[PDB]
Design a protein around this ligand. Sequence first.
Ligand code: KW3
Length: 298
Amino acid sequence: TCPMDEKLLSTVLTTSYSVIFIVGLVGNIIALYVFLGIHRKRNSIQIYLLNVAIADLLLIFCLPFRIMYHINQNKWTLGVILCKVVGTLFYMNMYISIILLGFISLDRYIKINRSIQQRKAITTKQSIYVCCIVWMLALGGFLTMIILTLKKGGHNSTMCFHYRDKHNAKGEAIFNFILVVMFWLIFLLIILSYIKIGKNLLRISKRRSKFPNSGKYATTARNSFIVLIIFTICFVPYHAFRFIYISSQLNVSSCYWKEIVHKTNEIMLVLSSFNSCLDPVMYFLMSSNIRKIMCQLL
Ligand SMILES: CCOC[C@H](COC(=O)CCc1ccccc1OCc1cccc(Oc2ccccc2)c1)OP(=O)(O)OC[C@H](N)C(=O)O
């Protein structure tokens, strides 16, 4: 455990996480207000996005502990219990957000590309069913893993969010490895969905059957590509490097690899958490009614 300099890393992480925290807080507050205050009725996609907003708001509420830890002296003043609570809660919220974004991709694909008329907008029932299942499965994993870590593991210290060996705890490592591959499957589904949606909207706009609103389809096709690219840049490099993280952490090696691996992991955490603040903004910007409201109000 080489105690290497991280003051510049601490400062850059503190600044990045503070900006992400404030932007995500304001964005998720606005998203909750619009999904509750002015949205009387919900469809499957809107319920999905409300749950994404709740997960992102929980990750944003998790962030201030991280910024305080990084800014104070890069040491954790409080107990290991809160360290474990925050560390597990941040990751569970992140993966809930990822899963629900994959479901938003999927139902957008089935609703736009292949649907002919409608499904009478009764897909909401299965939407809350899937949302409840995912939240219950996340909460169960949260409780079991935290209750195992607090008692079974004797590694209690005054340092948090740091690099640790997984010789004592290999279940956490294998569960993280499974999380990465399921995230990659979700990302492949997301990219397929959004490429197909964009191509369908471009061909529909290119046919130009009716002159009115023949240019909004091109805008919607562009928006699909934009949201797919934002998701990619936010999440892909992180889970690309998490493989090297696990490979280095599950075997004995010189700490010289460890500092650069830890620094890369933290930088990728910054990009991943930035999606939390970005997600509410894309809904407001890509919605024609909300965009016009923003344009006329400003
Ligand atoms: C105990 C400290 O945890 C935080 C971190 C280590 O994080 C991991 O190894 C990944 C997260 C993880 C993996 C395996 C099991 C539970 C995990 O915690 C989150 C979680 C909870 C519940 C469910 C769940 O998976 C879901 C699956 C399906 C649906 C919804 C959720 C995930 O350690 P630390 O804070 O020290 O940070 C180390 C390092 N800086 C860094 O960033 O990894």
